[PDB]
C-alpha cells in the first residue's frame, strides 16, 4: 500500500462521491435512437481515519455496465472493495449502452418558403422528475451559408444568431423535469447556386443534469476500520450526480 500512508486521523470522518457521466446520443428525425452511450467515472473524496476497508455498492445487474476499469486499490473477484487513497481519487470508470435515460427530447420542424425563407420550430422536452432541475441548457440550430439574417422568438431563455458560426444558439439557465419549451426562428436566405441541397446538420444540445443517465444510483459505501474506535454510523457520507451531454445530436 504505497498509495496511503499509515498514520491518518480526523475528528470528522467524511467521504464525498461524485458520479460523473457524459451521455451521448444520435437521434433520427422520426425519433429512432440511432446510437447512444454513457461514459462515467466515480470520484471519491475521502477524509477517513486510519487504513479503512470500504465496500462500494451501486445498483448493478438496477443497471447494466458493459465494461469498466478500476483503480489500483480495488481488489477484484463480486462487489467492489478497497482501501482508498487519502483525499481525492478516481475509484472507477465505466461505459453503458442499455436502458439509458435520455434527459432531453428534441423535436425539430423545418418548412421552406420558396427560396427566400426557412421556417424553423424546435421543441425541447425534459424527461425526468419535476423535483430535479437541469441547468446550462444550450440548443444549437445550424443555419445555411446563404443566410442574410435570422428572426427568433422564444418565451424561455435568450437566443442570438451567431453568423461567424452559422448557427442559432439558444441558452436557458435552468429547466425543470417534465416540461416543454419551444423556439421559433425565421431564416432569411440570400439566393444561391440552385443545385445546392442543404446538408441539414443535426440540432445539438448541451446540458447538465443532477442524475446519472446510465441509471446508476449509489446504494451504500461501507467503512470498516477495526483497529480504531469509529464505526460506520460515524462516517458522514455524500453523493452528487453530474450528468453532462457529450455529443447529443438530433437529425432534422
Amino acid at each position: 500500500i504505497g498509495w496511503r500512508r499509515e498514520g491518518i486521523k480526523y475528528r470528522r470522518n467524511e467521504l464525498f462521491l461524485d458520479v460523473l457521466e457524459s451521455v451521448n446520443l444520435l437521434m433520427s428525425p422520426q425519433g429512432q435512437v440511432l446510437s447512444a452511450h454513457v461514459s462515467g467515472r466515480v470520484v471519491m473524496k475521502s477524509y477517513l481515519s486510519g487504513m479503512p476497508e470500504c465496500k462500494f455498492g451501486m445498483n448493478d445487474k438496477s443497471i447494466a455496465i458493459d465494461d469498466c476499469t478500476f483503480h489500483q486499490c480495488v481488489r477484484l473477484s463480486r462487489s467492489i472493495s478497497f482501501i482508498p487513497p487519502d483525499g481525492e481519487f478516481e475509484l472507477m470508470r465505466y461505459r453503458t449502452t442499455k436502458d439509458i435515460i435520455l434527459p432531453f427530447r428534441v423535436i425539430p420542424l423545418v418548412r421552406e418558403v420558396g427560396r427566400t425563407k426557412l421556417e424553423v420550430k424546435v421543441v425541447i422536452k425534459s424527461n425526468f422528475k419535476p423535483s430535479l432541475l437541469a441547468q446550462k441548457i444550450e440548443v444549437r440550430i445550424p443555419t445555411p451559408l446563404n443566410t442574410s439574417g435570422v428572426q427568433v422568438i422564444c418565451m424561455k431563455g435568450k437566443a442570438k444568431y451567431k453568423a461567424s458560426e452559422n448557427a442559432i444558439v439558444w441558452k436557458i439557465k435552468r429547466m425543470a423535469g417534465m416540461k416543454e419549451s419551444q423556439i421559433s426562428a425565421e431564416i432569411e436566405l440570400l439566393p444561391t447556386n440552385d443545385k445546392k441541397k442543404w446538408a441539414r446538420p443535426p440540432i445539438s444540445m448541451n446540458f447538465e443534469v443532477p442524475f446519472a443517465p446510465s441509471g446508476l444510483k449509489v446504494r451504500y459505501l461501507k467503512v470498516f476500520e477495526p483497529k480504531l474506535n469509529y464505526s460506520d454510523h460515524d462516517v458522514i457520507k455524500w453523493v452528487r450526480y453530474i450528468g453532462r451531454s457529450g455529443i447529443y445530436e438530433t437529425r432534422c
Binding site: 464525498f16 443532477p210 449509489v218 446504494r219 451504500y220 457520507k237 455524500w238 453523493v239 452528487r240
Partner: peptide, 8 residues
Amino acid sequence: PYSYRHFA
C-alpha cells in the same frame, strides 16, 4: 445552489 446530498 445544492451540490452533495446524503444517499437515500
